[PDB]
Ligand binder design. Structure first.
Ligand SMILES: Nc1ncnc2c1ncn2[C@H]1C[C@H](O)[C@@H](COP(=O)(O)NP(=O)(O)OP(=O)(O)O)O1
Ligand SMILES: [Mg+2]
Ligand SMILES: [Mg+2]
Length: 431
DNA sequence: ATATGACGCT
DNA sequence: AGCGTCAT
């Protein structure tokens, strides 16, 4: 009772850009704004695979991973923008640079952890306290949170509109706030949400990009909260909202549970929602899923998670990959050498950029391949030393460490055909 | 036939 | 080290 830890010791946020690749193209081309539009790679095969969808196009049913020709059937007025192609492969330089614009603005407010190209976690714990002493006891007006939803609110007896429902929840939340108390976790989330409103106001104002965000006590709840009110809104998930939120929250919606372990949690325990995990003791969950998973599950279903926000705005690896599906699979020794050079050339261009910008050198190269028929994403991984940022040496050394896999007695041929080539620069050191 | 990045297990 | 899982 008096000695229970509720996991209310941190204020963690997850900011995620709304249809990021689309917004990047819409800022560059005004004709694409406020219209159903999507981003595609490789216009040849069925018009190109869609990798980002605007919300105007999502209303028609256009989704990611869909072929552009199929998406034109659902949305005939759909506009398209192609990803730049360099050396025969997709080139995402325009979006990595747009990412750095946002990451540097978020870095001004608090420590962030780059989670993807369009999202980063934030640890607002140190920023919330210093803001609390600056507001010497004065309350928080709703004008400081013009786009914040309070998950679970409004409730009970006192509108039909979406935005009307938002403020009544914020009103109930603010009216019950304990500003008398600086050790109140619910007050810390509110100050954290005020800061995120300022961060997101700075992002849109200095880049033109809109984003959603989640504010809670850990990374998992923040990411879940971020998806509740997209687009362009932030959601506060408090500790008290967890039981009702998790009572019907599918297990797959929780981070790290959308894969196989989440499936076995559903099958073995025979449950549907995240809240049903509270019935089980920790030893039971440890016996079914291991000591790490059982401990993590037992605390997560109660809204408690301890994975810290690592101060890391830079990637740990720099890699280049390209798939060769179907009959396009590389089957000649000349093809494999040529594409390894194309990958190594772009890799050098990115590594030299990384060494001048970020003062570090990659020290080893990882070569990954997939053969025709193998189900796993990777079929084989071999590694060597990355001494020079030389595209011809890297591609040559990459070929040296994979030429054994060629089960073809012929010199000029390559069997089995290669489905994917992948070079990855890892193991950085200060330069 | 939809290019990447972080991390755990052994 | 090499493979597997999870994610955008
Ligand atoms: N499977 C994939 N293939 C290629 N590119 C992808 C991808 N997933 C993401 N991207 C690229 C394209 C995306 O623009 C960006 C982030 O994708 P999200 O954050 O998962 N979803 P979005 O930001 O598009 O909209 P919203 O967050 O409101 O749902 O990374
Ligand atoms: Mg996004
Ligand atoms: Mg995202």
């Amino acid at each position: 009772g008096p000695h229970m830890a509720t996991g209310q010791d941190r204020v963690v946020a997850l900011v995620d850009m709304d249809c990021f690749f689309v917004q990047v193209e819409q800022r560059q081309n005004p004709h694409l704004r406020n219209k159903p539009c999507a981003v595609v790679q490789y216009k040849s095969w069925k018009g190109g695979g869609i990798i980002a969808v605007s919300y105007e196009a999502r209303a028609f049913g256009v989704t990611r991973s869909m072929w552009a020709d199929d998406a034109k059937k659902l949305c005939p007025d759909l506009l398209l923008a192609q990803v730049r192609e360099s050396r025969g492969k997709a080139n995402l330089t325009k979006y990595r640079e747009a990412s750095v614009e946002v990451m540097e603005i978020m870095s001004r407010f608090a420590v962030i952890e780059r989670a993807s190209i369009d999202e980063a976690y934030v640890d607002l714990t140190s920023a919330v306290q210093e803001r609390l002493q600056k507001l010497q006891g004065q309350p928080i007006s709703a004008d400081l949170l013009p786009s914040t939803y309070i998950e679970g609110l409004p409730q009970g007896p006192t509108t039909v509109q979406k935005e009307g429902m938002r403020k009544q929840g914020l009103f109930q939340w603010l009216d019950s706030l304990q500003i008398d108390n600086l050790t109140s976790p619910d007050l810390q989330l509110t100050v954290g949400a005020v800061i995120v409103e300022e961060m997101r106001a700075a992002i849109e104002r200095e880049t033109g990009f809109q984003c959603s965000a989640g504010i809670s006590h850990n990374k998992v709840l923040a990411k879940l909260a971020c998806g509740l009110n997209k687009p362009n809104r932030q959601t506060l998930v408090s500790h008290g909202s967890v039981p009702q939120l998790f009572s019907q929250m599918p297990i797959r919606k929780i981070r790290s549970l959308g894969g196989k372990l989440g499936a076995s949690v559903i099958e073995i325990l025979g449950i549907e929602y995240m809240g049903e995990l509270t019935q089980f003791t920790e030893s039971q969950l440890q016996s079914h899923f291991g000591e790490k998973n059982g401990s993590w599950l037992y605390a997560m279903c109660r809204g408690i998670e301890h994975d810290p926000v690592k101060p890391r705005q830079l990637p740990k690896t720099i890699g280049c990959s390209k798939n060769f599906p179907g009959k396009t699979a590389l089957a000649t020794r000349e093809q494999v050498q040529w594409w390894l050079l194309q990958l190594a050339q772009e890799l050098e261009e990115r590594l030299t950029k990384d060494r001048n910008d970020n003062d570090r050198v990659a020290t080893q190269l990882v070569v990954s391949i997939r053969v025709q028929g193998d189900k796993r994403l990777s079929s084989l991984r071999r590694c060597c030393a990355l001494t020079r940022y030389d595209a011809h040496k890297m591609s040559h050394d990459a070929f040296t460490v994979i030429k054994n896999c060629n089960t073809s007695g012929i010199q000029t041929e390559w069997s089995p055909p290669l489905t994917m080539l992948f070079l990855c620069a890892t193991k950085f050191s200060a330069s």
